[PDB]
Amino acid sequence: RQFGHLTRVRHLITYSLSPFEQRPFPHYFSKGVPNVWRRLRACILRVAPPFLAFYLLYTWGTQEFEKSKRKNPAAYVN
Amino acid sequence: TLTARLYSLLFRRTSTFALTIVVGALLFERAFDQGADAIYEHINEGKLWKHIKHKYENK
Amino acid sequence: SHTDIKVPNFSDYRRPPDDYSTKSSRESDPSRKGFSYLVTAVTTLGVAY
Amino acid sequence: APNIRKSHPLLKMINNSLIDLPAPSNISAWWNFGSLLAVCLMTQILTGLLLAMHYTADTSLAFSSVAHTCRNVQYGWLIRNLHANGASFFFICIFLHIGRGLYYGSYLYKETWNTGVILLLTLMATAFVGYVLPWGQMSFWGATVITNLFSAIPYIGHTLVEWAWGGFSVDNPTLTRFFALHFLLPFAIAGITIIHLTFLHESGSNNPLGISSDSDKIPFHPYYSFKDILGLTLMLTPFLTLALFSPNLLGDPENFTPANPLVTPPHIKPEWYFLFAYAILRSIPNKLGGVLALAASVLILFLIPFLHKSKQRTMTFRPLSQTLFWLLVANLLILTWIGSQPVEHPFIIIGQMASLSYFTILLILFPTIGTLENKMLNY
Amino acid sequence: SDLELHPPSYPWSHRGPLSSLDHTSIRRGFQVYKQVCSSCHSMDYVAYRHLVGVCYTEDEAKALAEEVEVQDGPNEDGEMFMRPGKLSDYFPKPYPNPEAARAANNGALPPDLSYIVRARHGGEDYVFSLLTGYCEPPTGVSVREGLYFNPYFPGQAIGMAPPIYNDVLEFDDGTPATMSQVAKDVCTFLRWAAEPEHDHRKRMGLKMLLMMGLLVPLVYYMKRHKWSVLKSRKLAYRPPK
Amino acid sequence: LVDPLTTVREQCEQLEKCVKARERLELCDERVSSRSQTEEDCTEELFDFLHARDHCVAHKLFNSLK
Amino acid sequence: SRWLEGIRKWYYNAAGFNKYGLMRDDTIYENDDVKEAIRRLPENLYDDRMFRIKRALDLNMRQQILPKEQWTKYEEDVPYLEPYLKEVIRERKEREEWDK
Numbered sequence: 001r002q003f004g005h006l007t008r009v010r011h012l013i014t015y016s017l018s019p020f021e022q023r024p025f026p027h028y029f030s031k032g033v034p035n036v037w038r039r040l041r042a043c044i045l046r047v048a049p050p051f052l053a054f055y056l057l058y059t060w061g062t063q064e065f066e067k068s069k070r071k072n073p074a075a076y077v078n
Numbered sequence: 079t080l081t082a083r084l085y086s087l088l089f090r091r092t093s094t095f096a097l098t099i100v101v102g103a104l105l106f107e108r109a110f111d112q113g114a115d116a117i118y119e120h121i122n123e124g125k126l127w128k129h130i131k132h133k134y135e136n137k
Numbered sequence: 138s139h140t141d142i143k144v145p146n147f148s149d150y151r152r153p154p155d156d157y158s159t160k161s162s163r164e165s166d167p168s169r170k171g172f173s174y175l176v177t178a179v180t181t182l183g184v185a186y
Numbered sequence: 187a188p189n190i191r192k193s194h195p196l197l198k199m200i201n202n203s204l205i206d207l208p209a210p211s212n213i214s215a216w217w218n219f220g221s222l223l224a225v226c227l228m229t230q231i232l233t234g235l236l237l238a239m240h241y242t243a244d245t246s247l248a249f250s251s252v253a254h255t256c257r258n259v260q261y262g263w264l265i266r267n268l269h270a271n272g273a274s275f276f277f278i279c280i281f282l283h284i285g286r287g288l289y290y291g292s293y294l295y296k297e298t299w300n301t302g303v304i305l306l307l308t309l310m311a312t313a314f315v316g317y318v319l320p321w322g323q324m325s326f327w328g329a330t331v332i333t334n335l336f337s338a339i340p341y342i343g344h345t346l347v348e349w350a351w352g353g354f355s356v357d358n359p360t361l362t363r364f365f366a367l368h369f370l371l372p373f374a375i376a377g378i379t380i381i382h383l384t385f386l387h388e389s390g391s392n393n394p395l396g397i398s399s400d401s402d403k404i405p406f407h408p409y410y411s412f413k414d415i416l417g418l419t420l421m422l423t424p425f426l427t428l429a430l431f432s433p434n435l436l437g438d439p440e441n442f443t444p445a446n447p448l449v450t451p452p453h454i455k456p457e458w459y460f461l462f463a464y465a466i467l468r469s470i471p472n473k474l475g476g477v478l479a480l481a482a483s484v485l486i487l488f489l490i491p492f493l494h495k496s497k498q499r500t501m502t503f504r505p506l507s508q509t510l511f512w513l514l515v516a517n518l519l520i521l522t523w524i525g526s527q528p529v530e531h532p533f534i535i536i537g538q539m540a541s542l543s544y545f546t547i548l549l550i551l552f553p554t555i556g557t558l559e560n561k562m563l564n565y
Numbered sequence: 566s567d568l569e570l571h572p573p574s575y576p577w578s579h580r581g582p583l584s585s586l587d588h589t590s591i592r593r594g595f596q597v598y599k600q601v602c603s604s605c606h607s608m609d610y611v612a613y614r615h616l617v618g619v620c621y622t623e624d625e626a627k628a629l630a631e632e633v634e635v636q637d638g639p640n641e642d643g644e645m646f647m648r649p650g651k652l653s654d655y656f657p658k659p660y661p662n663p664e665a666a667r668a669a670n671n672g673a674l675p676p677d678l679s680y681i682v683r684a685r686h687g688g689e690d691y692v693f694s695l696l697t698g699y700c701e702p703p704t705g706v707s708v709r710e711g712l713y714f715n716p717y718f719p720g721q722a723i724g725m726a727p728p729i730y731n732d733v734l735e736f737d738d739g740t741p742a743t744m745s746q747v748a749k750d751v752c753t754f755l756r757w758a759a760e761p762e763h764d765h766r767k768r769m770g771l772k773m774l775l776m777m778g779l780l781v782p783l784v785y786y787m788k789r790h791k792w793s794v795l796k797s798r799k800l801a802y803r804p805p806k
Numbered sequence: 807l808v809d810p811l812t813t814v815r816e817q818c819e820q821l822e823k824c825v826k827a828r829e830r831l832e833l834c835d836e837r838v839s840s841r842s843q844t845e846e847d848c849t850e851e852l853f854d855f856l857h858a859r860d861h862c863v864a865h866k867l868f869n870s871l872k
Numbered sequence: 873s874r875w876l877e878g879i880r881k882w883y884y885n886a887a888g889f890n891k892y893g894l895m896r897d898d899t900i901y902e903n904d905d906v907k908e909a910i911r912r913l914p915e916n917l918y919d920d921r922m923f924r925i926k927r928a929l930d931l932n933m934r935q936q937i938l939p940k941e942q943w944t945k946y947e948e949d950v951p952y953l954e955p956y957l958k959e960v961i962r963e964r965k966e967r968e969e970w971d972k
């Protein structure tokens with residue numbers, strides 16, 4: 001598929017300025033950084049969980065394995 | 079007015095641009111190496127052979 | 138009717154500080170292109186290395 | 187014609203695939219991996235070729251030919267490193283590439299997706315047979331254990347392995363055919379990679395919001411060329427940092443000992459990018475089923491397109507399955523772990539559990555949470 | 566029991582990402598390799614030639630290869646004969662073949678140290694700990710004839726007897742040759758011997774980091790620049806109603 | 807001549823963890839050698855001492871080496 | 873005990889396809905049915921949807937959403953295609969049947 005036969009579009013007016021008449025990385029604070037946060041706090045509660053969960057299991061696992069090696073002070077009290 | 083002088087003289091003509099990408103590179107190389115080496119070597123005084131050399135080449 | 142249509146404001150919003158009406162955009166932009174191209178000129182440069 | 191860039195039989199091919207090519211505007215950064223994957227390939231083939239020019243494929247010269255390449259061949263050390271570490275950059279990317287597709291339903295473009303699975307299989311094989319080449323303890327033992335697996339295949343089994351490699355055991359006659367195979371496959375990857383992009387180009391490129399992009403596409407080049415080159419550097423910098431500061435960070439030391447058939451190392455395990463499956467392999471005890479689990483761990487990808495139920499393509503607006511998805515990656519991540527560990531209690535369990543939670547999330551949860559997710563939208 | 570003790574972790578002069586090897590120490594190490602290890606441990610991949618320009622002068626190294634004679638190609642009559650080693654010869658092998666060595670070191674086989682530092686988990690940290698670390702076996706544990714207890718070694722029984730005590734050799738640069746100290750240099754040597762690139766590879770890593778630093782922001786600004794035309798764009802729907 | 811090692815170990819062997827670990831060790835040592843038929847070894851207890859001693863030996867040893 | 877109605881509203885706001893300003897129907901994946909369906913859609917609606925969909929791609933392109941005010945409220949979402957999409961599907965099942 002090429003250009004000129006994608007869709008039946010009507011009544012949309014767009015306005016844009018040359019790259020040289022504007023700023024590249026504008027308003028890092030006014031709108032920039034906020035949205036970055038507007039995002040970290042939007043998925044953290046959806047992504048983090050299973051990862052955190054994984055972690056606990058990784059730890060439990062390693063710790064347990066590393067315990068089942070050491071001897072029990074009482075396997076021989078005689 | 080560097081930037082403006084720059085554009086007019088160096089960045090306007092496709093020809094001029096390329097030509098300063100080269101002369102610009104030669105100069106960048108020479109300067110960027112020395113500088114890096116320097117920074118490198120200095121963070122390692124008395125460890126490099128270039129430093130220990132004299133002891134055995136006489137000194 | 139189209140006469141009823143204006144171009145929104147990019148003033149401040151996006152325009153770099155040398156762009157606000159009643160002042161020729163042209164005296165200030167050979168300087169604006171100079172910067173940009175300089176950044177690009179530098180990349181081609183760094184890349185060659 | 188005027189343009190003379192849209193008329194020429196060859197340029198027209200380029201100006202229609204890297205310029206003037208209609209790409210959606212809202213393409214996410216996840217789409218930067220096809221690019222990377224491709225350049226990742228150019229890179230391997232290069233460094234490899236250049237590295238093959240100093241290698242000898244013979245039990246008695248392999249290990250040292252490589253060593254010599256590193257100690258004698260100018261910048262040889264760097265080339266080897268890049269190639270080795272590159273293998274990983276390659277898989278990390280191919281894995282993020284799969285991902286993006288799995289969760290933007292890119293896979294609904296069946297043909298372009300099926301070839302992609304063939305790309306993964308191929309890229310694997312070439313990387314398995316390629317690690318033997320240096321002929322170190324793991325190279326050898328890995329080859330001997332992993333190849334011998336086919337042995338489970340009843341009847342026409344032993345005879346396959348027994349022919350696959352040299353004659354009776356991973357020895358010279360197999361290092362050669364492996365070297366050859368390694369040299370050949372990458373070019374087949376590139377070949378197929380063309381078919382991949384062909385099928386792709388048939389339809390547009392999918393996008394994050396999963397709804398028709400026709401509404402407003404943008405010329406690839408002016409934009410995406412830049413976009414990808416940016417990605418190239420942003421991802422290539424860690425590659426090099428790793429490649430130049432901790433060269434062996436991801437490499438088994440045991441593979442610095444020339445192969446020796448009288449010393450089987452403890453903990454024989456394939457490269458990390460294979461572990462997840464190595465895990466699911468030793469999950470089921472019955473040697474046969476084990477292979478099948480292994481085979482299915484990857485081949486399942488062919489089924490994904492038939493397990494899509496959502497009335498929506500991507501899963502941007504599908505919070506439920508969204509956690510299911512991450513719950514899944516986490517799962518693979520765990521399988522990886524379990525694979526690097528010995529076959530002992532704390533693990534053995536976590537292993538077959540995770541392994542089980544793998545096939546369920548793909549086979550049964552996803553599709554189910556799928557429809558259920560539809561009812562909730564009144565559909 | 567698959568129970569083991571793991572080496573600590575010393576601040577080697579060459580662990581910094583930007584810090585190279587201390588060649589003065591490398592030089593030393595070479596000496597302890599040559600004067601003590603080289604009688605059991607082969608180092609097939611390094612050769613005198615390498616010392617040149619790194620921790621020894623050309624002539625200095627030339628004279629150091631002379632000290633050893635090597636077996637060389639057929640006569641005019643076809644037989645093996647000896648001769649003073651040149652600069653191009655690789656470090657001598659202590660034994661004609663493995664089995665030959667296994668029989669000289671009571672069964673065990675002293676590994677070639679060319680890549681040792683990277684053939685064992687821990688690298689120098691490991692080797693060091695191992696060298697300066699033998700001691701009597703703990704209670705209940707008994708090592709057999711010919712083996713020597715060393716906790717740091719898996720199985721805690723090494724076929725290798727403590728190879729390094731105070732003095733044993735005398736660093737000529739004028740350095741207090743204490744076991745601990747001597748073992749340090751030997752380790753920094755083993756490092757170099759395993760990856761001579763090291764210093765080169767890092768100075769390089771520096772230069773790469775600075776390029777990434779400079780290159781990405783440029784292309785970032787460039788990417789941001791072309792795009793702006795969209796990021797800033799403004800739609801509007803105007804049906805004639 | 808005196809090896810800085812042995813000096814910096816004497817100090818370390820006095821730090822809490824060490825002293826606390828040396829003890830838990832000497833006990834097992836004198837207990838395993840006291841019976842005639844026991845399977846216990848004092849390897850574990852020993853390592854803990856070494857994993858502790860050495861850890862600080864490292865934090866300082868190299869300060870004295872050239 | 874727990875209204876599907878309570879739920880549906882939960883999910884709607886959960887999904888979030890409204891923060892972009894588009895109706896539920898503006899997201900249904902365009903398989904064969906939805907394609908026929910949309911083609912039957914009156915022109916009023918077609919252009920309406922067209923703009924919405926583009927306004928969404930643009931937000932998404934900018935990594936920015938629509939201000940809270942403009943978020944389409946659950947109870948005001950207009951199922952503009954479902955009626956059509958429905959006939960399409962039963963029109964088809966009729967044929968999928970006859971041809972047997």
Ligand code: HEM
Pocket residue numbers: 597598601602603604605606670673674675676681685692695722723724725726728729751
């Ligand atoms: C010289 C100071 C010296 C070094 C250095 C050294 C190192 C070394 C290492 C790291 C090993 C490998 C340990 C492992 O297998 O993980 C090792 C092993 C043996 N060595 Fe050694 N060794 C040094 C010197 C000597 C000397 C002088 C001899 C011979 C008299 C010798 C011998 C051996 C032997 C035998 C082994 C045992 C291997 C085993 O499996 O038991 N070493 N050495």
Ligand code: HEM
Pocket residue numbers: 216217218219220221223224227280283284286287290292293295298299300301302303305306309375379382383386390391392393487
């Ligand atoms: C080495 C092999 C591969 C290379 C070089 C490669 C290359 C590409 C390229 C150039 C793109 C375009 C940009 C993008 O959408 O990311 C692409 C798209 C795609 N690839 Fe691959 N690919 C490879 C492997 C795979 C694999 C393993 C799969 C399948 C599991 C796959 C699935 C896809 C699909 C579905 C698209 C994306 C469509 C979209 O969402 O827009 N590719 N691939």
Ligand code: HEM
Pocket residue numbers: 227230231233234235236237238239241252266269270273276309312313314316317318319320368369370371372373375
């Ligand atoms: C598809 C891209 C490729 C992948 C995935 C790949 C992967 C690998 C792997 C895993 C290694 C092992 C590195 C190590 O020893 O740790 C390797 C080695 C090797 N590859 Fe490739 N390779 C690829 C392409 C090539 C090609 C096409 C050539 C050259 C024609 C090549 C030639 C070699 C050689 C000679 C070695 C042995 C030298 C060495 O291992 O250092 N490789 N490759």
Ligand SMILES: CCCCCCCCO[C@@H]1O[C@H](CO)[C@@H](O)[C@H](O)[C@H]1O
Pocket residue numbers: 115186765768769772773776777
């Ligand atoms: C993509 C960024 C690439 C960074 C450029 C790589 C720089 C490699 O530069 C290398 O530095 C060494 C140390 O001085 C020199 O000995 C080599 O001759 C030189 O090629």
